[PDB]
Design an enzyme around this catalytic site. Structure first.
Site, short mmCIF file in Angstrom:
data_model
loop_
_atom_site.label_atom_id
_atom_site.label_comp_id
_atom_site.label_asym_id
_atom_site.label_seq_id
_atom_site.Cartn_x
_atom_site.Cartn_y
_atom_site.Cartn_z
N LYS A 95 15.01 8.56 18.01
CA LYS A 95 14.37 9.48 17.07
C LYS A 95 13.01 8.99 16.61
O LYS A 95 12.06 9.77 16.49
CB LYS A 95 15.23 9.75 15.85
N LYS A 121 19.92 3.35 8.74
CA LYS A 121 21.12 3.25 9.54
C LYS A 121 22.23 2.74 8.60
O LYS A 121 21.97 2.25 7.48
CB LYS A 121 20.95 2.31 10.73
N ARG A 122 23.47 2.84 9.06
CA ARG A 122 24.58 2.34 8.23
C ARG A 122 24.40 0.84 7.96
O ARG A 122 23.88 0.10 8.82
CB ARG A 122 25.94 2.65 8.89
N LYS A 165 23.92 -5.06 12.25
CA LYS A 165 22.61 -4.37 12.26
C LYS A 165 21.50 -5.18 11.57
O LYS A 165 20.30 -4.88 11.69
CB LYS A 165 22.74 -2.99 11.64
N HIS A 195 32.13 3.32 22.90
CA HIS A 195 30.94 3.22 22.08
C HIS A 195 30.81 1.89 21.35
O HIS A 195 29.96 1.76 20.51
CB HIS A 195 30.90 4.33 21.02
N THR A 231 20.77 5.35 18.45
CA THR A 231 20.12 6.63 18.64
C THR A 231 19.00 6.87 17.62
O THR A 231 18.01 7.57 17.96
CB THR A 231 21.13 7.79 18.57
O1 LIG Z 1 27.18 6.08 21.07
C1 LIG Z 1 26.84 6.55 19.77
C2 LIG Z 1 26.80 5.38 18.79
O2 LIG Z 1 28.14 4.97 18.49
C3 LIG Z 1 28.22 3.95 17.49
C4 LIG Z 1 29.66 3.73 17.22
N1 LIG Z 1 30.52 2.98 17.97
C5 LIG Z 1 31.75 3.05 17.41
C6 LIG Z 1 31.66 3.88 16.32
C7 LIG Z 1 32.76 4.22 15.38
C8 LIG Z 1 34.00 3.57 15.42
C9 LIG Z 1 34.97 3.88 14.46
C10 LIG Z 1 34.73 4.85 13.48
C11 LIG Z 1 33.50 5.49 13.45
C12 LIG Z 1 32.53 5.17 14.40
N2 LIG Z 1 30.35 4.26 16.20
C13 LIG Z 1 27.55 2.68 18.03
O3 LIG Z 1 27.62 1.60 17.09
C14 LIG Z 1 26.09 2.97 18.40
O4 LIG Z 1 25.46 1.86 19.06
C15 LIG Z 1 25.98 4.18 19.31
O5 LIG Z 1 24.60 4.53 19.45
C1 LIG Z 2 20.68 8.92 14.16
C2 LIG Z 2 21.44 8.67 12.91
C3 LIG Z 2 22.29 7.48 12.80
C4 LIG Z 2 22.33 6.46 13.92
O1 LIG Z 2 21.26 5.55 13.67
P1 LIG Z 2 21.33 4.10 14.43
O2 LIG Z 2 20.07 3.48 13.94
O3 LIG Z 2 21.42 4.38 15.90
O4 LIG Z 2 22.56 3.43 13.86
C5 LIG Z 2 22.99 7.28 11.63
N1 LIG Z 2 22.93 8.14 10.59
C6 LIG Z 2 22.20 9.28 10.59
C7 LIG Z 2 22.22 10.21 9.41
C8 LIG Z 2 21.42 9.61 11.76
O5 LIG Z 2 20.68 10.74 11.85
#
Ligand SMILES: OC[C@H]1O[C@@H](c2ncc(-c3ccccc3)[nH]2)[C@H](O)[C@@H](O)[C@@H]1O
Ligand SMILES: *Cc1c(COP(=O)(O)O)cnc(C)c1O
Ligand SMILES: OC[C@H]1O[C@@H](c2ncc(-c3ccccc3)[nH]2)[C@H](O)[C@@H](O)[C@@H]1O
Ligand SMILES: *Cc1c(COP(=O)(O)O)cnc(C)c1O
EC number: 2.4.1.1
Lengths: 810, 810
Positions: free
Chosen positions: B654, B542-543, B548, B351, B650
């Site tokens: 949405k 988003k985070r 980002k 991911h 993702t």
């Molecule tokens: O595939 C689902 C999402 O996974 C996120 C993700 N990758 C690694 C982590 C991650 C690593 C370490 C601790 C917690 C979370 N999170 C990506 O940044 C998104 O693009 C992606 O849409």
């Molecule tokens: C969908 C969702 C995310 C992921 O959003 P991205 O814009 O793809 O980083 C993060 N947090 C919450 C609460 C969500 O519902």
């Protein structure tokens, strides 16, 4: 099956069966193909619990409408045991549930064995609180028990190589169906901080906050539709607590540790900070709840008319300065008015005169933890000592003796003195104990305020301690005198009319024999131990302590063994000697006593010459559920504490009610038991309190007894030489040294009289008919020892409320 | 009320009402006189939960009988959000419950707001796992989600003085009605210890034991009567743990801390021991459960036919050496056979390509914690590198690059390399990301085993993310094309026939307007903030992360502000700019970005010249329940990560489904979204991946952009000089320094194109009809991004199982 267990009506049985199946499916999320006995237990518990709910809601509504005086029983311990059977008994559902489960293909007795004891106490004091709650509900009092919901109760005892090992009592692991969490009524409790003096009063600031979350457990009365509440507090950290990030969240355990574990000491004071935090936590949360309920009825004049607080020993003694704090600092009452309210609201029960059990907290702990409370205690002390000085002018030693503050290396606060000053009533727990309080440790207080001092002899509930544990006995009694005695135990006096009735004599003896067979089977099944059910069952079950003198019993057992080895071919009445109880984990001598008992068993039980004439069994993990099994099975109850040391005892009363005869000293409630039954019907031996005082005056010299009693010398030489520990010959040297040179409880002084009295026991057991007749005379006179009697006395003489036997509508 | 919410039949409504009242009385132990909205929520939750039970038991029975291949989805995160509405939606109970509660005098929407999110994830990865479980149930797969039941999930975010503060998410405080504890299926997990080599194999001995207790949560499929399980493990100490006495009991927290708290980092690796313990805990408990279920069907040849394990990133990577351990050490398979089984069973999803997110554990941690696993990893590595050496003889640099063991100051294990070696399939999460994996970080592995590498573009469930959160939109769609699209989202293509339909155009715009009004009201109510509902709602949720590029949005906002101040009397399209998201507590730059956003708001929102033409709001505590509110209300979705950094995204999907247009870079799934909708219907700007590579080759010099773009220079001078922080003029110096000298994500390089693209957005918003037509073209082509599509691809191409849309019997 049996009458006292209630009706098994077709409609009720049908309804119970469908609700059982409903819970199994919807609550437990199981089907009958994979369900275990534990799932079946839980399905039955939820089914029975549903019957409490309407009565619980209606009882509490009733108190809101009628606004009676409310009684708050504060204790650090509630030793509840199992709840399923008790609930069925009090709601008259036992036979219906038996039938319903029978029709589902289940054995209800087997399901009952799955339930964990709620072990939130050490022994007698915690179990007294539990009997009291049962009586208060049965007598229709608006009563609440308040305590701490410990995550871990009294430890489970394992015996490994003859030694006690402790393991955590994870009683909540499978969930507790009997409690209802009430997170919505969570309250803050403050610790540490400092006091600021302003223009308008003191202020306690910069405190650390811990939350107190309540869990409520229903307490059903006996067939009166009353369901009272036991509210137990659990410690929670606030969500901003310590708020790098991960560590701050993990450190929430610092706050939550307050409710983690019950201190496992019986009749002993351990002055640790965590224990003090527990004591304040229960008091602070409880008093907010009390005041909330009172305001939902500005004028605190009426507080004592609407509230009684009963302190179960000094453990909740901080209620006194906390109530003053709230009234003075927060409600802004003047001191004198606040004090008047406090005194009229609080009452104190003392449960011990042993010096090592009396709470004396170091001032420096209170200074750091509870700075405003220390200030208040100092002010109480100054005002109290001003009263003493005016009453006994010039008596400067009285001033130092009566002070709440003890001078010395470390200054300490004497919590018993605090309780007496701040309570309108102070009671002991048996007549001899209450007299000892006035003559010795509280003599100065009695001279100042004689009106405060009372006696309330302890009791036990005959629901748990006869109907539940000994249905066979309850039934044969009910056949003769009806069922009314279950809530009016004095009616057992009617059984005196049956002491010459051959049928009754036979039935009483048959019930005992059946109980003994059942217990002997339990032993084999769960502990692969083989006992002779025709032997006399000689039992001492209670916490292990020097003052309770399990060691004196040990000396007797060795004496019997040595007498057999000396004349193997002479007849002796066969005995099974059973000793059980937990030792406090830090109490080295008590742990050594356990090892001695098992060591004696290892020798005695394997000597081919003895055969099955003498067996010595250590009953492991003694607790309320085990008491309910062994007490109905006993022939002889060992109640052998040194005169002046057992404030009351309550095991003694349980054995009396269940058809055992008692061998005992004139200590605690044993005195009143002998008085009720007649001294001729009790095996009394040993020093009285006044004989102990005479010995202390001239000086106790154990060597004198060793020198004059050859049988006693033989035993000591056996202990010292390694007869009971071949591989470790010096194993019991601490025990021998204690007995010979620093025995505070005078074991040797009562040895000869004890052995002689035991011979009289054996002689009577050879005549079954006369043994049984003496039993009937004990059972028949056990009525005084119902806790219904005890609670009616508290109600009338301390709390100022009238008991009622009237049913609420169902 | 509305069609897609199901039927409100008289019988059903009557039954729901009586069960609601039953739970209120018997379950909650309340009456209507004292019940609060929270009690009412719980009564409804228990009522709805009862409808899951039969289907849950029957589904799991069905899998036992039919013995299909089972899919195990292992994740450290499941970001579930609220459960009540989702459950009603999937069981077709929403309108019946609405009616029932309406007749009881309650507003169901108000009750829904009481439920806590289950926040057991950080963001996208955790929420993907949750969407996947919903799709797997909807497609009839025998699937289980396995994770950790954290006591504390993602922290609650408070903004104080413009700064993020964290507070613990005590989500279990009032209880969780959706889980079922299963203490009877508790399993041991081992840590520490040492390895002994015997005559017949290695033995892992002298370990510390922690217990793993499972809690099961039902996962209902959409109207197919399938109810799958999410099993989450909780850490418990054994009862003899550490067994002076009091301290030993308190020290149980050391073992229980494993499940206490979710690590709150998104797309970042923190190499701490507690995190490693969490990773092994979930893997070890899960694999015992998998093997148990497999044996209850000796011959492990069939294991891969009956089991698939999907690793959600490398977090559960220890599954690979744990499965080898069990097969080799405990079941006594030879190595080669065990390896064949392991490879065919495991599959790995990557991911992220960010280096700081890749797990590389220090060997010394594994050596101490998991000594046998380290041995196994070394053996895997030697055998793998022997294969590399045979395929690419003499290529010694390839050997060092591909090794599982990284040499250096501290030796580390590269867990991604371990996952590739031990899995039969490796996938990325969007086409561009999967291509990047083969071209860059996993190029060597792709050359060795090209067949392993796949793509599975992510998706979102249209149950939660359309029907539940945007019922108004779901309804107007269903009016035209029926309801089948809810489980077959490609049917939305039928809406292209309505792009010139004046009625549909009006309805789509009205639904958006109603969502915007509702959200604007929510703002005032819960946060006393006043926004203009006719403005363009421009949202980036988003985070908070450098990659980002919330900072790029900030630069645009300041540009708009400066342009207004320069020509106050010129017309500009009004905007409400909303930015929300959590920063990891240790991520200093992300915390500074939050402060910058609030600081910009403080200036902009109070400038009288701006009026209500521009508002900047920081949305506090962004989480799944807040996403469900704001996403339906958005006009413009900001998806502006530097090309090559967002593996998929993702949130983007949405917003597309809910009628927002997207401004975005060609990154992650944005590429596929533009391809589906048409580039003409997407606001694309900025560097592509190949442009980023070209810039890196010649060297990124931010000063060049500063020198050539006067509007950009103005903003930097404002930041540096204290325009946005008057009392602390140097407050944002870290931000300016980063932008000017060490910006890994090239914010300035995309600035001009971004601002120009935003002007095109504003121009289209001035023409409501054409804006809405472009929206319809987006909604209509969003079908590919259903997680039903994603899961069908995993099923067919990785797991070797066929999805089914067939109903189980009710
Ligand atoms: O595939 C689902 C999402 O996974 C996120 C993700 N990758 C690694 C982590 C991650 C690593 C370490 C601790 C917690 C979370 N999170 C990506 O940044 C998104 O693009 C992606 O849409
Ligand atoms: C969908 C969702 C995310 C992921 O959003 P991205 O814009 O793809 O980083 C993060 N947090 C919450 C609460 C969500 O519902
Ligand atoms: O009144 C009930 C019983 O209370 C016991 C008791 N007194 C003090 C404590 C005690 C102190 C500290 C910690 C835990 C318990 N326990 C007495 O020893 C019994 O005689 C008496 O029957
Ligand atoms: C009654 C009881 C006690 C008290 O027994 P005494 O002999 O009065 O000390 C202690 N423990 C348990 C489990 C009891 O039921």
């Amino acid at each position: 099956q049996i009458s006292v267990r209630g009706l098994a009506g077709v409609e009720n049985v049908t309804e119970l069966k469908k609700n059982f199946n409903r819970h199994l499916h919807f609550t437990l999320v199981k089907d009958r193909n994979v369900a275990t006995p534990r799932d079946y237990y839980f399905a039955l518990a939820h089914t029975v619990r549903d019957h409490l709910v309407g009565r619980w809601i209606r009882t509490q509504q009733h108190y809101y409408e009628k606004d009676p005086k409310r009684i708050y029983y504060l204790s650090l311990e509630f030793y509840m045991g199992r709840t399923l059977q008790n609930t069925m008994v009090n709601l008259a559902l036992e036979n219906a549930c038996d039938e319903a489960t029978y029709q589902l293909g289940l054995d209800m007795e087997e399901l009952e064995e799955i339930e964990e004891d709620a072990g939130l106490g050490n022994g007698g004091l915690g179990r007294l609180a539990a009997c009291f709650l049962d009586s208060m509900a049965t007598l229709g009092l608006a009563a609440y028990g308040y305590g701490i919901r410990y995550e871990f109760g009294i430890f489970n005892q394992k015996i490994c190589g003859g030694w006690q090992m402790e393991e955590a009592d994870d009683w909540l692991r499978y969930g507790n169906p009997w409690e209802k969490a009430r997170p919505e009524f969570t309250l803050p409790v403050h610790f540490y901080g400092r006091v600021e003096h302003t223009s308008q009063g003191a202020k306690w600031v910069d405190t650390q906050v811990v939350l107190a979350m309540p869990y409520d457990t229903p307490v059903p009365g006996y067939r009166n539709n009353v369901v009272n509440t036991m509210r137990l507090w659990s410690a929670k950290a606030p969500n901003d607590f310590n708020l790098g990030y991960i560590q701050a969240v993990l450190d929430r355990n610092l706050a939550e540790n307050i409710s983690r574990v019950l201190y496992p000491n019986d009749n002993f004071f351990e002055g640790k900070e965590l224990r003090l935090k527990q004591e304040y936590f229960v008091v602070a949360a409880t008093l907010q709840d009390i005041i909330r309920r009172f305001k939902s009825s500005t004028n605190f004049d009426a507080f004592p008319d609407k509230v009684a607080i009963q302190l179960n020993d000094t453990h909740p003694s901080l209620a006194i300065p906390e109530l003053m704090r709230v009234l003075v600092d927060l409600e802004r009452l003047d001191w004198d008015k606040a004090w008047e309210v406090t005194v009229k609201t609080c009452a104190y029960t003392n449960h011990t005169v042993l010096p090592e059990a009396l709470e004396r907290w170091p001032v420096h702990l209170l200074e750091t933890l509870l700075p405003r409370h220390l200030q208040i205690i100092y002010e109480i002390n100054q005002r109290f000592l001003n009263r003493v000085a005016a009453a006994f002018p010039g008596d400067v030693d009285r001033l130092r003796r009566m002070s709440l503050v003890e001078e010395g290396a470390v200054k300490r606060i004497n919590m018993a003195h605090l309780c007496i000053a701040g309570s309108h009533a102070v009671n002991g727990v048996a007549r001899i104990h209450s007299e000892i309080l006035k003559k010795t440790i509280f003599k100065d207080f009695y001279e100042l305020e004689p009106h405060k001092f009372q006696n309330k002899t302890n009791g036990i509930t005959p629901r748990r301690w006869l109907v539940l544990c000994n249905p066979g006995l309850a039934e044969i009694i009910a056949e003769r005198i009806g069922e009314e005695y279950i809530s009016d135990l004095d009616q057992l006096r009617k059984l005196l009319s049956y002491v010459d009735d051959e049928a009754f004599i036979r039935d009483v003896a048959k019930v005992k024999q059946e109980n003994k067979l059942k217990f002997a089977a339990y032993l084999e099944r769960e502990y692969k131990v083989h006992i002779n059910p025709n032997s006399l069952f000689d039992v001492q079950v209670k916490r292990i302590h020097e003052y309770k003198r399990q060691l004196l019993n040990c000396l007797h057992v060795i004496t019997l063994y040595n007498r057999i080895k000396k004349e193997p071919n002479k007849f002796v009445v066969p005995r099974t000697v059973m000793i059980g109880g937990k030792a406090a984990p830090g109490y080295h001598m008590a742990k050594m006593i356990i090892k001695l008992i098992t060591a004696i068993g290892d020798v005695v039980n394997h000597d081919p010459v003895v055969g099955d004439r003498l067996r010595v069994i250590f009953l492991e993990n003694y607790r309320v559920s085990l008491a309910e099994k062994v007490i109905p099975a006993a022939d002889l109850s060992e109640q052998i504490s040194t005169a002046g040391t057992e404030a009351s005892g309550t095991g003694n009363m349980k054995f009396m009610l269940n058809g055992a005869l008692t061998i005992g000293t004139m200590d605690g409630a044993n005195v009143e038991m002998a008085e009720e039954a007649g001294e001729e019907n009790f095996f009394i031996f040993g020093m009285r309190v006044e004989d102990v005082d005479r010995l202390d005056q001239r000086g106790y010299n154990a060597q004198e007894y060793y020198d004059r009693i050859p049988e006693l010398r033989q035993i000591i030489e056996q202990l010292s030489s390694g007869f009971f520990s071949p591989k470790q010959p010096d194993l019991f040297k601490d025990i021998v040294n204690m007995l010979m040179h620093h025995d505070r409880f005078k074991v040797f002084a009562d040895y000869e009289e004890y052995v002689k009295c035991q011979e009289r026991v054996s002689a009577l057991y050879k005549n079954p008919r006369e043994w049984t007749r003496m039993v009937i005379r004990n059972i028949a006179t056990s009525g005084k020892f119902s806790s219904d009697r005890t609670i009616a006395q508290y109600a009338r003489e301390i709390w100022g409320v009238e008991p009622s036997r009237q049913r609420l509508p169902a």
